[PDB]
């Protein structure tokens, strides 16, 4: 049992609500939120931008250490770095970007890094500004995360749609 409320059941291991991912983490505190992250770390916009603005940037502060010690992520990857107030932990996973030209077919190299964790909150990966189908998205994670995922989706339309379209 845990403290995630009100969320549709898609499958044995995945859930989906329609919520703000950033006063989902706030209310809940999760161990794990997930950022749908660029290689270089830079939380400009999209559901980053959004939590990196609730940790009052600290979250890019800590980011920056990071890249300056690690150098960028390889898209399809991830690192954990703090959680700051949202959660324990913040999985930083990158999904390709189709608006960069990035191979969809790393959507699931991105989705498989959720797999290191037993429970998660998440956005969509590679949805949004990240250019790709999120029905798409969806299905690449239900066939691909094993482990116990919470996806807060922030558009009240495309909640519906992806719910009812939801094979
Ligand atoms: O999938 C990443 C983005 C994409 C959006 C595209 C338009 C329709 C709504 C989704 N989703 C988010 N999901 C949850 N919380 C969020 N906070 C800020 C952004 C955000």
Redesign the pocket.
Known sequence: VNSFSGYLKLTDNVYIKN????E?AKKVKPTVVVN?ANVYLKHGG??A???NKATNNAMQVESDDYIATNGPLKVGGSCVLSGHNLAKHCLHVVGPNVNKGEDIQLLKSAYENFNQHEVLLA????????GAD?IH?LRVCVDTVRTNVYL????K??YDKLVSSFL
């Not at 919520?19 to 950033?22: G, L, R, T």
Request: proline content about 7%; hydrophobic content about 60%.
């Open positions: 919520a703000d991912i950033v989902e749908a999209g559901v931008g959004a939590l956005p969509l990966l590679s949805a949004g500004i990240f999120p998205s807060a989706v922030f558009d339309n495309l």
